Amino acid sequence: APGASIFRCRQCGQTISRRDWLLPMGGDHEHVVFNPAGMIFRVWCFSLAQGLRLIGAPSGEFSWFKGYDWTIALCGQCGSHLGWHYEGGSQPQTFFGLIKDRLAEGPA
Ligand X SMILES: O=C1CC[C@H](N2C(=O)c3ccccc3C2=O)C(=O)N1
Question: Can you spell out the DSSP letters for the chain?
Answer: --SSSEEEETTT--EEEEGGGB--BTTBSEEEEE-TT--EEEEEEES---SEEEEEEEE-TT-SSTT-EEEEEEETTT--EEEEEEES-SSSS-EEEEEGGGEEEE--
Residue of the chain from 18, 19, 58, 64 that contacts ligand X (CB under 6 A) = 64
Minimal distance, residue 46 CB to Zn ion, in Å: 16
Kindly tell me which of 13 and 72 has the beta carbon lying closer to ligand X: 72
Residue of the chain from 9, 25, 49, 103 that contacts Zn ion (CB under 5 A) = 9
Which residues ranging from 54 to 93 are in contact with Zn ion (CB under 5 A)?
A: 75, 77-78, 80
- Is residue 62 a contact point for ligand X (CB under 6 A)? yes
Q: Is 75 annotated as a binding residue?
A: yes
**Binding stretches for ligand X (CB under 6 A):** 35-37, 61-64, 70, 84
